[PDB]
Every structure is written in C-alpha cells, then in structure tokens.
Amino acid sequence: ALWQFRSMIKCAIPGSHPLMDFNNYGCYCGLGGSGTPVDELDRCCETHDNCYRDAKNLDSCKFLVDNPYTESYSYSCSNTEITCNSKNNACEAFICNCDRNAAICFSKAPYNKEHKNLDTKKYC
Ligand SMILES: COc1ccc2cc3[n+](cc2c1OC)CCc1cc2c(cc1-3)OCO2
Ligand SMILES: [Ca+2]
Ligand SMILES: [Ca+2]
Known about the structure:
It is found in: Secreted. It contains 5 helices and 2 strands. The protein has 124 residues and is mostly helical. The chain has a two-stranded antiparallel sheet with strand order 1-2.
C-alpha cells in the first residue's frame, strides 16, 4: 500500500523524505507519466508504474478501486534491507516486489535536483 512504499524508501535511504524527494520528480515519479524518463531515478519510477500496470493486468487480482496502492502486504526493514514477507499472497507479493525493487532502485540512482518539479508538458 502507498504508506508502506514511502516507508520502504526510508528503509532504503535513511536520510530521505520520500514525498518531498521522489514525488513529482522527472517524467514518471508522480501521478501517471509521459514520454521517456530523464535519468535512472526517473526510470525507476516508470518501471514502478509499469510494475503496477502488470499487477492490474493479473486476472487473479482485483484491487480495491482498481488501485494496487490500496493493497497492504507485510514487509520488514533491517539495516537498509527490505524483506517482502513470504506469507504475502500472490497479489500482495507482486505489489511488495514492485515497491521493494523501486526503493532499491531509488537508492542507487543519482538524485538530480534539477529534475524535481520538471516542466513535464515541455520535457516529457
Ligand atoms: C492513489 O491515489 C494516490 C495517492 C497518492 C499518490 C502519491 C504517489 N503517486 C500517486 C498517488 C495516487 O494515485 C494513484 C504515484 C507515485 C508516487 C511516488 C512516490 C510518492 C508518492 C507517489 O512518494 C514516494 O514516491
Ligand atoms: Ca508515475
Ligand atoms: Ca492486503
């Protein structure tokens, strides 16, 4: 679920404020997306969007109000490491893995200040 993704990010990047740092970044970090990501971080965001689009295209999973962000799973944080709980159901595990891969991706991508609040209508 959305709150857990924010906290997965804090797990992976202890000095981060997820909503301030990664929301409305580039062309994909934020609601929807368009065009081509502008850097690796932005590209982590598109892959996450894409990862969410695949979960919805799973016939077995009917997410509340069709949003995978509503679906809570179980995970833990230790010393920078995210672990998605094996007891998560197949749909919760898919979402957990979207969020974890994204938090791990964010932690490794260069953060370019200039791509925060990008002019998307122009550059995306
Ligand atoms: C579901 O309604 C909401 C509610 C909140 C939302 C807030 C975020 N997104 C859409 C939202 C949304 O739309 C689906 C998409 C991506 C994203 C990445 C982030 C983040 C927040 C969000 O902070 C950490 O990096
Ligand atoms: Ca997005
Ligand atoms: Ca759940």
